[PDB]
Write a protein that holds these residues in place. Sequence first.
Motif, PDB file in Angstrom:
ATOM      1  N   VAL A   1     -15.056  54.817  -6.128  1.00 28.37           N
ATOM      2  CA  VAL A   1     -14.802  55.827  -7.156  1.00 28.37           C
ATOM      3  C   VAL A   1     -15.483  55.454  -8.464  1.00 28.37           C
ATOM      4  CG1 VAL A   1     -13.049  56.817  -8.634  1.00 28.37           C
ATOM      5  CG2 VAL A   1     -12.741  56.844  -6.192  1.00 28.37           C
ATOM      6  N   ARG A   2     -15.236  54.244  -8.965  1.00 31.08           N
ATOM      7  CA  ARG A   2     -15.919  53.829 -10.188  1.00 31.08           C
ATOM      8  C   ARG A   2     -17.419  54.047 -10.081  1.00 31.08           C
ATOM      9  NH1 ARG A   2     -13.677  47.984 -12.121  1.00 31.08           N
ATOM     10  NH2 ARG A   2     -11.523  48.546 -12.671  1.00 31.08           N
TER      11      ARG A   2
ATOM     12  N   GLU B   1     -18.695  56.479  -8.413  1.00 38.07           N
ATOM     13  CA  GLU B   1     -18.772  57.922  -8.629  1.00 38.07           C
ATOM     14  C   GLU B   1     -18.824  58.263 -10.114  1.00 38.07           C
ATOM     15  OE1 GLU B   1     -15.841  59.348  -9.889  1.00 38.07           O
ATOM     16  OE2 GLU B   1     -16.339  61.474  -9.844  1.00 38.07           O
ATOM     17  N   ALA B   2     -18.060  57.547 -10.931  1.00 34.77           N
ATOM     18  CA  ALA B   2     -18.044  57.858 -12.357  1.00 34.77           C
ATOM     19  C   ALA B   2     -19.263  57.288 -13.061  1.00 34.77           C
ATOM     20  CB  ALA B   2     -16.766  57.338 -13.004  1.00 34.77           C
TER      21      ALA B   2
ATOM     22  N   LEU C   1     -21.881  59.886 -12.282  1.00 38.35           N
ATOM     23  CA  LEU C   1     -21.631  60.964 -13.229  1.00 38.35           C
ATOM     24  C   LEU C   1     -22.051  60.573 -14.633  1.00 38.35           C
ATOM     25  CD1 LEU C   1     -18.450  62.570 -11.896  1.00 38.35           C
ATOM     26  CD2 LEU C   1     -20.713  63.505 -12.163  1.00 38.35           C
ATOM     27  N   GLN C   2     -21.984  59.288 -14.956  1.00 35.16           N
ATOM     28  CA  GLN C   2     -22.574  58.838 -16.205  1.00 35.16           C
ATOM     29  C   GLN C   2     -24.067  59.074 -16.209  1.00 35.16           C
ATOM     30  OE1 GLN C   2     -22.576  58.503 -19.498  1.00 35.16           O
ATOM     31  NE2 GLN C   2     -20.827  57.165 -19.111  1.00 35.16           N
TER      32      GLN C   2
ATOM     33  N   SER D   1     -11.693  52.047  -4.442  1.00 35.93           N
ATOM     34  CA  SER D   1     -11.779  52.061  -5.898  1.00 35.93           C
ATOM     35  C   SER D   1     -13.226  51.979  -6.358  1.00 35.93           C
ATOM     36  CB  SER D   1     -10.970  50.919  -6.500  1.00 35.93           C
ATOM     37  OG  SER D   1      -9.586  51.115  -6.283  1.00 35.93           O
ATOM     38  N   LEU D   2     -13.851  50.813  -6.193  1.00 36.07           N
ATOM     39  CA  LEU D   2     -15.202  50.618  -6.713  1.00 36.07           C
ATOM     40  C   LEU D   2     -16.172  51.647  -6.166  1.00 36.07           C
ATOM     41  CD1 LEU D   2     -15.123  46.799  -6.825  1.00 36.07           C
ATOM     42  CD2 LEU D   2     -15.039  48.421  -8.678  1.00 36.07           C
TER      43      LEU D   2
END
Lengths: 48, 48
Positions: free
Chosen positions: A37-38, A40-41, A44-45, A34-35
């Motif tokens: 992936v977060r 990853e976002a 992307l931010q 998870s973290l």
Amino acid sequence: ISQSETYRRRRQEWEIQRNNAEAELKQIDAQLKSLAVRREAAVLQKTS
Amino acid sequence: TQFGSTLQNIIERQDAEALNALLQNQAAELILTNLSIQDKTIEELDAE
């Protein structure tokens, strides 16, 4: 019979408790992907 | 001089236009990235 009975019982305690820790750990790794992936976002931010 | 004024107005108005357009083009270019972020955070709901 009673002594080996007690030994089997405590052994069952060990089994339950180890298994507890195991399921815990696989949970942990789930939270790690998870973290990841977060992360990853949030990168992307950054690039956004 | 009247041709002067009306032309100056043409030019102010022209650059003003190309501004509005250039903005909308940028708006698209950003909403793409922000969209992808939103997708990945859905993925982080999958991971959770």
